[PDB]
């Protein structure tokens, strides 16, 4: 059972995908690859659909003002928002995820952009 999707991400505004009525014991697989631009894929899975924008924005708020160590603050926030996630598990910066369905019900898949730095003259997430 394989399905394809294509989309566009603008300024860290993610896209939700619905997985209606999965059964306990199923295994979900995900992979997200960049096909244009400077996008850095990120994927997460959760039960109740809530917009991560408000929570992820505080990570950019903290790093922009201090040291804060982004890789620490992002992991802590992600481990709360999502039941499972992956940043760079694939070829390059592409993500890949394996997730065993805990119980019976429906879940949501979140695709979007992570917080990264892409400069060597100065640090700016």
């Amino acid at each position: 059972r394989v399905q394809h999707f294509t989309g566009y991400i603008e300024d860290g505004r993610g896209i939700f995908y619905s997985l209606p009525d999965m059964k306990q014991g199923d295994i979900i697989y995900a992979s997200m690859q960049n096909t244009g631009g400077n996008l850095d894929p990120l994927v997460g899975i959760m039960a109740e659909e809530i917009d991560p924008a408000v929570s992820l924005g505080q990570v950019l708020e903290k790093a922009l003002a201090s040291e804060n160590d982004l890789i620490s603050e992002l992991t802590a926030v992600a481990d709360r928002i999502f039941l499972g996630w992956d940043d760079d598990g694939g070829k390059g910066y592409s993500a890949s995820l394996e997730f065993t369905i805990p119980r019976d019900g429906t879940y949501h898949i979140f695709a979007g952009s992570t917080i990264t730095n892409q400069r060597l003259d100065k640090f700016q997430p």
Binding site: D69, T116, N117, L120
Partner: protein, 160 residues
């Protein structure tokens, strides 16, 4: 003189076609790398850096790291200069590690381990906390590969 370069080695056991130089891999392996039986060789390098008023940001590039390797670094100021920030990113700028201030807060240290087939690392040292023109602050930077004893090296910089 001696010579330098890369090479391809084909070994055969009771396979007379090897001496032709065209033997394709077959059968079950019989030989292995000898260096894997012992401990790796450490490489250590120390440099002195200065952060001027207009040069408060400095970056350095590291040689390629093989999978399984380890990377350590530490910074210690010469005198009363304030402790700068330390972080580690790849060639594209993706963050990988951040510096930790020790309980005796006179130095900052960093650590990392290699997972990918080829890793290219860049070390960032910056003191642009604000806009103060401190002047001629100078720091000592110590780096090593497969050298967990950088705290007390003892030996002079060894290896490449």
């Amino acid at each position: 003189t001696y010579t330098t370069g890369s090479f391809q080695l084909i070994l055969g056991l009771n396979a007379p076609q090897v001496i032709s130089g065209e033997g394709e891999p077959e059968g079950e392996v019989f030989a292995s790398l000898a260096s894997l039986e012992i401990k790796p060789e450490a490489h250590v390098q120390e440099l002195e850096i200065r952060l001027d008023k207009d040069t408060r940001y400095l970056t350095q590039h590291t040689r390629n790291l093989q999978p399984g390797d380890t990377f350590h670094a530490l910074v210690e100021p010469i005198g009363e200069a304030p402790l700068p920030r330390l972080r580690l990113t790849d060639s594209g700028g993706k963050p990988l590690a951040f510096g930790l201030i020790d309980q005796p807060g006179e130095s900052v240290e960093l650590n990392y381990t290699c997972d990918q087939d080829i890793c290219e690392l860049v070390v960032h040292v910056d003191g642009t906390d604000g806009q103060k023109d401190s002047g001629e602050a100078v720091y000592r930077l110590l780096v090593g590969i497969n050298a967990p004893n950088l705290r007390e090296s003892g030996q002079t910089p060894v290896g490449s």
